[PDB]
Ligand binder design. Structure first.
Ligand SMILES: Cc1nnc(C(=O)NC(C)(C)c2nc(C(=O)NCc3ccc(F)cc3)c(O)c(=O)n2C)o1
Ligand SMILES: [Mn+2]
Ligand SMILES: [Mn+2]
Length: 200
């Protein structure tokens, strides 16, 4: 979409080198939990806030129409996400494993109270470059598939959106979610080979 400047390409390329070199030393893809926000329009619009891993959607919220994510809201979301994670992913209840968290750096995602919450949860937060939805599984995989399916829908209500999302998420095979995460290394490689430009 955007015309990347030098600082932006540098940061993309450097981030991807770091993630890729880590990956080659010891793959960590199975420990990533990732998420992002997207507007869904009906009749007005509601923000979908969703988090997922290679096994499926862990937790989501659909905010009241017009409502936005601010710092306080994101902090509570992360807390609620962690409760869902304990219930749905045993490997993490048992603290056999540490969560690796991939989200973008929207201001609410980096505010002081949110940084504190992440420190306390003690999730590892992966680096992520500005203007890089091609590096964010929610964008290049989850919402890319969703957007096509949404384009046919004309939702009557907030309830219709929620129903549709429950159904849609659940109809995807485990393989869909796994592919979206495990696409990361190829994309990190492409980005390093483009010196940080966008790529096909
Ligand atoms: C940086 C920066 N500035 N604009 C952007 C950007 O990438 N915008 C566009 C609209 C492309 C975009 N954005 C977000 C997103 O969250 N943007 C909020 C945000 C703003 C600043 C910041 F540092 C990080 C995040 C998406 O999720 C997304 O899918 N897209 C497509 O990146
Ligand atoms: Mn975003
Ligand atoms: Mn996005």
């Amino acid at each position: 979409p955007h015309e990347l400047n030098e600082r932006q390409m540098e940061r993309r390329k450097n981030t991807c080198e770091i993630l890729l070199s880590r990956y080659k030393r010891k793959s960590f893809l199975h420990r990533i939990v990732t998420g992002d926000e997207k507007w869904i329009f009906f009749v007005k619009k509601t923000m979908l806030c969703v988090w997922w891993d290679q096994s499926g959607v862990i937790y989501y919220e659909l905010l009241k129409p017009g409502e936005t994510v601010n710092a306080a809201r994101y902090q509570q979301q992360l807390i609620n996400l962690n409760r869902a994670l304990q219930r749905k992913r045993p490997e993490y209840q048992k603290r056999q494993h540490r969560v690796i968290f991939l989200h973008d750096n929207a201001p609410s995602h980096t505010a002081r109270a949110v940084r504190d919450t992440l420190e306390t949860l003690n999730w590892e937060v992966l680096p992520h470059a500005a203007y890089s939805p091609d590096l964010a599984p929610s964008d290049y995989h989850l919402f890319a598939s969703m957007g096509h399916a949404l384009a046919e829908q004309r939702f009557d209500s907030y309830e219709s959106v929620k129903k549709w999302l429950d159904e849609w998420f659940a109809a995807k095979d485990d393989e869909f979610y796994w592919r979206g995460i495990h696409k990361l290394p190829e994309r990190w490689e492409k980005c390093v080979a483009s010196d940080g430009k966008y790529f096909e």
